[PDB]
């Protein structure tokens, strides 16, 4: 890709998301999703191989199907209220379709099958956009229509995502599939608290984006896409193993790291609503995620895996990738718990 | 509701089921995707026309334009898939299992 | 599914045993169908008759588990004369747990299922008695 | 207001002190980012690029200062809303008559 | 009766959808969609949507569906399999028609049917607007308003179409 | 909107098409203009929780204008009673 | 009715002429990828996208009646320029070539 | 819900203006100039009451003024007028520009015999003012009382008491 075209396509991705977040009209929300999808396909295809073509095709079909269901919900809403305003919907059938459409876009279980495959089939930089920026638009709609959302449906989607995301990650050695199942589990926490306190959805979303961006950036810095490739980092960039260790433990929700804060604040909100079984089940199930984060820390940081002779050649050359914002992101990924009350800025 | 809404809603469902029950040709699924859009256009036009909601008259056109541009992207991916395996069968798109 | 659970919970405890088993079997039998549906969809059976055999296999097991749980749980309350006691479903839950071990021909799985199903069933009675919410309505 | 970071009413509140302990922590986080920047690029961690390290601290403090202001404004708004609601609905928040422990009866549970 | 033309068209509309949704060869699936598109225009025409109806012919049928058929000739099929020669397509085709017929038979007899949701059967003419004598097409006034009210709609639509050109060239370069 | 840029900048990007009682070309009214107008004014500024109960009457009327489900049900009732009576020869339509 | 009668007559007559063409006394007693360029696919897609922009331009004769002429003309020219820009992009990117 | 009041069938009887559209088209410009007062009183009533049942009396005065208008053409200008609207009637679009010769003859006849002046371009589209003794409608939409607004909040914004109060935090 021409560097100027790449920038223009990236801005179109951003503009599609922004349109969704500033629109008060359902048609413009739908247009935002269409624009966003149109511009995201070229960055998935940018390395021109059969796996990239398969990923883009599977992505296109899933997102296109969801956008059709979103439009169907919009028209049903128009039939029963005679208006297009982006807010609660005025028909239960429209609410179910819109909720399922957005769950499909987010990749929540049991509409989750595309996320591991699409992420595996596209470059790390494209996966970073897919699993972070692309969550903003569907979540911003869910933030506005949640009063009309069926509580049983949304909590069922949340519980299944935490279970599927946790179990799916245990069997993975590919770093992009691990991140994909991590994403599915984390969307579950975001939507579980949505009916009770949407502010905690935003808090979990922002913190998730920061840690996920950190992990993808560190994977890109070393061009690692597999567990065994990542296990060579100790014999090249020892510092990077420590950063990876801390970030993974944060993503595991261990105190006193930043990734504890969203799980902690979400448990608080549901208990205030006399919801005890659900937070307890979710916290225990999230130990599945902690297990396969810990496995990565074992092979990356806490043990020294075997190396290769040709690695000595790498010792002589500096790390020249941009690694943009990594020092900032990694510090926020790990050391923000003392500043937790700052979550009220999102209110 | 009116009679027509029964059949128009049914047509959307039929094409949705058709889309979710894949066969072999990827083209056949793109047709079901475009059938869903057709019924959406007809359903919205009928609602907007009957209610005399004048400024919404442009909405079905905007839907048609974006959907067709969206269908163009789908056809581009189909030809790239077909250039790789010689057919558009969806059972060839299983490398990422 | 709300309606099926309603008639089960509508009836008292240790009364109309044949009605409880019908309800529990119906609940369990449906779950076997849902499990069967995804199984054949995501794991294509070798032949049409092979898929029917798999569907019957799963559905029979799920129906059997629910049937025994309701039968065993409602008799226990009847014999012990303790309608509102979690231990009744603890017996009902383990009974259904053992059936799974039999259907899977694994004494280890039966013991594991006995405990997990037994504790789960007991917790369901405590929640019913004390109004535990799983999907709590937002209040604050 | 709508889509305003710090509405005009927030100027009635006292500003955060430049010696705020939270602001010092934010400054510390900025310093840590400066060191990790040197480490990933294999520079001398403590000495390298003092100009860069100065901007890391300054950037974090500057952004941290305004986030602290919004944080304090949002909690003040929360308290302001809550007291107004209590004032406007005295029937839901009655001043109950408190009794003394000599009057109230509490069961004794011996530990023996 | 002619008073039920819209209902009659909507019945054919559904059959066309069953035609290509059962997914025969995409050559015939495309034909089923062309017929549905033409019938879809007919429905829209009878609700006063002259301009919107003709856009279906011009854009949906004369544009998008031509490219669909064009691409099918290149990348999908050149010869079609005998229509209904596959058991699955015929089964789906027969399944849809019978479901459609049972829906139509009951609504006509009762002037109302309950397929999941409640539907009337008196006729679509009953919901129509009664008084009209403006000296213009209201449907045309709304679409023309795109250039005076919908500045925002034009910009984002215009941008997206330009991006479509850029993106498709990137996708197909290889 | 999630970010209300339109209100904050005072720019109308899409609010003009959101409702059918807004300004229209050549003052063409929608069929349910008065019903939507009444329901919007009742529900303005009190929030959807309050509006769902206190403006229920306006919304019910507005929904009747939109879909005419009650009106069709009443006509379908008179049509049933006529083409029945006509069979028992007890009614004769006027010229 | 008149238009439907016209359409029925035109295509019914076409059907009759086609069948009598196929029938007459003869007095006798005894799915893959075409080897076809990607360029031709790109012509079809390019036509489609331009055809969509022509759809947006068709209302222009009615839009010229508005009192908001300043806005109408600016958006009308904006749409055509962007259509020209996409043509320029294809041209410079060798998209209108056949070699 | 109540019963929709409707006026009796004999409360709606009136002498209708039983002439074709090309006759009205030919007479429209003089008609608009001559019958403006009852016409605008009726249109004021319709847009104010929003109820056709409430303007039936003024609607009747519209017919009377129109019948009197045409009885006055029939009494002085019958033959020039018949030539004119017969030329209008011939056109499929009933165009004025095809009949300027016959229009002038009719225009001259009414001016000479009735002092009628044809309104100039732009006149009949003017917004005019009408004097009416009909009281201004109070609740034309028949709207209920509006819900009371939520208790508005007014006061001095003080710092949050003891900060966020989140678990253990002191600020
Ligand atoms: C309160 C909650 C908790 C705290 C929240 C805090 C949130 C983060 C606060 C903002 C952090 C910004 C990053 C700190 C600055 C570090 C970069 C630096 O000092 O280098 C000097 C920078 C370039 O130094 P360098 O040697 O090329 O590389 C520095 C890092 O390696 C460059 O590393 P990089 O590759 O990641 O570069 C990213 C940076 C690009 O780096 C820059 O261009 C510096 C921009 C700093 C912006 C200051 C933001 C704070 C002010 C907000 C207003 O991106 C930006 O532009 C940031 C906007 O010089 C300048 O450009 C000065 C700014 C001129 C405008
Ligand atoms: C109102 C609602 C809308 C109603 C629509 C009315 C109908 C209008 C048409 C709608 C579109 C239908 C599109 C059908 C389609 O294109 O997919 C053909 C689809 C794939 O075509 P194929 O590649 O030629 O393979 C044919 C067989 O699947 C054989 O391929 P195989 O390699 O898989 O052979 C082994 C076979 C073995 O089959 C089994 O083992 C079945 C065992 C079931 C146990 C009970 O495996 C399967 O059949 C997999 C599917 C089995 C069903 C999964 C459980 C559900 O084949 C079918 O499954 C035929 C089903 C069509 C039934 C028509 C009625 C539709 C009812 C759908 C539910 C509607 C609810 C709403
Ligand atoms: C500027 C200036 O000149 O004066 C500022 C200030 C003078 O202000 P002041 O009004 O006189 O009152 C200061 C009193 O000491 C404090 O007065 P205070 O009444 O405001 O009390 C402090 C208050 C103020 O609000 C704050 O939250 C500020 C947080 C202070 C930093 C704590 C983070 C380090 C955690 C301990 C390790 O803290 C809280 O209310 C929350 C309690 C925080 C407990 C720490 C753990 C909370 C998160 C749990 C996960 C982390 C576990 C431990 C790791 O002097 C300072 O104390 C500096 C602030 C300390 C932070 C900057 C230094 C960074 C420390 C890095 C620790 C490395 C950890 C190794 C692992
Ligand atoms: C707060 C989170 C901040 C996240 C910052 C992430 C910065 C990007 C990652 C830094 C690592 C180096 C880098 O610049 O990323 C590379 C990538 C560009 O792709 P690349 O392969 O490097 O080259 C393109 C030429 N084909 O860069 C990109 O494509 C940018 C993709 C990331 C943008 C989405 C970030 C998440 C959303 C942030 C919103 C926060 C709310
Ligand atoms: C304050 C409030 C917040 C509280 C939460 C806790 C915040 C702390 C987490 C901050 C984020 C992680 C950043 C940690 C900085 C690590 C830098 C370091 O200590 O040195 C790394 C070391 C140097 O390697 P290098 O520079 O490449 O070459 C050495 C030649 N002299 O690299 C090596 O030599 C590799 C050594 C082998 C790996 C040993 C792994 C065990 C040690 C891990 C310690 C970090 C664990 C972080 C978890 C939190 C701890 C509480
Ligand atoms: C410690 C934990 C707390 C740290 C939080 C730091 C977040 C960054 C500071 C931003 C503060 C802010 O004002 O944003 C809060 C805003 C409020 O959410 P909103 O939907 O607008 O409505 C609120 C009504 N309750 O909502 C948000 O801004 C949060 C949602 C972020 C979504 C990212 C969208 C990025 C779009 C950027 C477009 C420009 C490209 C850069
Ligand atoms: C609270 C602390 C949070 C972590 C602070 C950020 C870590 C910064 C220290 C660092 O990353 O560098 C380690 C550095 C390694 O030594 P050096 O020989 O200079 O090799 C670097 C080659 N460029 O070490 C140095 O020589 C610089 C001296 C500072 C080292 C600090 C060690 C950090 C250990 C953090 C463990 C977790 C603490 C709890
Ligand atoms: C290893 C642990 C595994 C997870 C264990 C999870 C335990 C979860 C407990 C489930 C919730 C408690 O169980 C549920 O409680 C509510 C009461 O609030 C009951 O609610 C019902 O009870 C009454 C009984 O008269 C019925 O009339 C009525 O239908 C309804 O009120 C449900 O019938 C019961 O199923
Ligand atoms: C903008 C705000 C920035 C605030 C920065 C405040 C601290 C800045 C310190 C700058 C000077 C650091 O200078 C650097 O320090 C370390 C230890 O101190 C020295 O290097 C060290 O190596 C080893 C320890 O690793 C020891 O032998 C000994 O401690 C020392 O020799 C370097 O020889 C010196 O170059
Ligand atoms: C990819 C490119 C992205 C570039 C984004 C640039 C943003 C463009 C902003 C367009 C909207 C400008 O702001 C908006 O313009 C239109 C026309 O001028 C105005 O609209 C005007 O035309 C009609 C006439 O009645 C009505 O909509 C309205 O009565 C009138 O104000 C809006 O009052 C104004 O709010
Ligand atoms: N929907 C929810 N339960 N949560 C929620 N956002 N409640 C609103 C209550 C609240 C809480 C903190 C602050 I600071 C402010 Cl100003 C207001």
Swiss-Prot record, chain A:
GO terms for molecular function: NADH dehydrogenase (ubiquinone) activity. It is an enzyme of class 7 (translocase). It is found in: Mitochondrion inner membrane. Its EC number is 7.1.1.2. GO terms for biological process: mitochondrial electron transport, NADH to ubiquinone; mitochondrial respiratory chain complex I assembly. It is a multi-pass membrane protein. It catalyses: a ubiquinone + NADH + 5 H(+)(in) = a ubiquinol + NAD(+) + 4 H(+)(out). Keywords: Electron transport, Formylation, Membrane, Mitochondrion, Mitochondrion inner membrane, NAD, Respiratory chain, Translocase, Transmembrane, Transmembrane helix, Transport, Ubiquinone. This is NADH-ubiquinone oxidoreductase chain 2. It comes from Bos taurus.
Swiss-Prot record, chain C:
The chain crosses the membrane at residues 21-42, 57-79. Keywords: Acetylation, Electron transport, Membrane, Mitochondrion, Mitochondrion inner membrane, Respiratory chain, Transmembrane, Transmembrane helix, Transport. It comes from the Eukaryota. It is a multi-pass membrane protein. Its main location: mitochondrion. It is found in: Mitochondrion inner membrane. InterPro entries: NDUFA11. GO terms for cellular component: mitochondrial inner membrane; mitochondrion; respiratory chain complex I. The modification N-acetylalanine is found at residue 1. Pfam families: Tim17. GO terms for biological process: mitochondrial electron transport, NADH to ubiquinone. Complex I is composed of 45 different subunits. Belongs to the complex I NDUFA11 subunit family. Accessory subunit of the mitochondrial membrane respiratory chain NADH dehydrogenase (Complex I), that is believed not to be involved in catalysis. Complex I functions in the transfer of electrons from NADH to the respiratory chain. The immediate electron acceptor for the enzyme is believed to be ubiquinone. This is NADH dehydrogenase [ubiquinone] 1 alpha subcomplex subunit 11. It comes from Bos taurus.
Curated annotation (Swiss-Prot), chain D:
It comes from the Eukaryota. InterPro entries: NDUC2 (IPR009423). Keywords: Acetylation, Electron transport, Membrane, Mitochondrion, Mitochondrion inner membrane, Respiratory chain, Transmembrane, Transmembrane helix, Transport. It is a single-pass membrane protein. The chain crosses the membrane at residues 49-68. Pfam families: NDUF_C2. There is a minor unacetylated form of subunit B14.5b. The keyword Magnesium does not apply. GO terms for cellular component: mitochondrial inner membrane; mitochondrion; respiratory chain complex I. Its main location: mitochondrion. It is found in: Mitochondrion inner membrane. GO terms for biological process: mitochondrial electron transport, NADH to ubiquinone; mitochondrial respiratory chain complex I assembly. Complex I is composed of 45 different subunits. Interacts with TMEM242. Belongs to the complex I NDUFC2 subunit family. Accessory subunit of the mitochondrial membrane respiratory chain NADH dehydrogenase (Complex I), that is believed not to be involved in catalysis but required for the complex assembly. Complex I functions in the transfer of electrons from NADH to the respiratory chain. The immediate electron acceptor for the enzyme is believed to be ubiquinone. This is NADH dehydrogenase [ubiquinone] 1 subunit C2. It comes from Bos taurus (Bovine). The gene is NDUFC2.
UniProtKB/Swiss-Prot annotation, chain F:
The keyword Membrane applies. It comes from the Eukaryota. Residues 29-73 form the CHCH domain. Disulfide bonds join 32-65, 42-55. PANTHER family: NADH DEHYDROGENASE [UBIQUINONE] IRON-SULFUR PROTEIN 5. Accessory subunit of the mitochondrial membrane respiratory chain NADH dehydrogenase (Complex I), that is believed not to be involved in catalysis. Complex I functions in the transfer of electrons from NADH to the respiratory chain. The immediate electron acceptor for the enzyme is believed to be ubiquinone. Mammalian complex I is composed of 45 different subunits. This is a component of the iron-sulfur (IP) fragment of the enzyme. This is NADH dehydrogenase [ubiquinone] iron-sulfur protein 5.
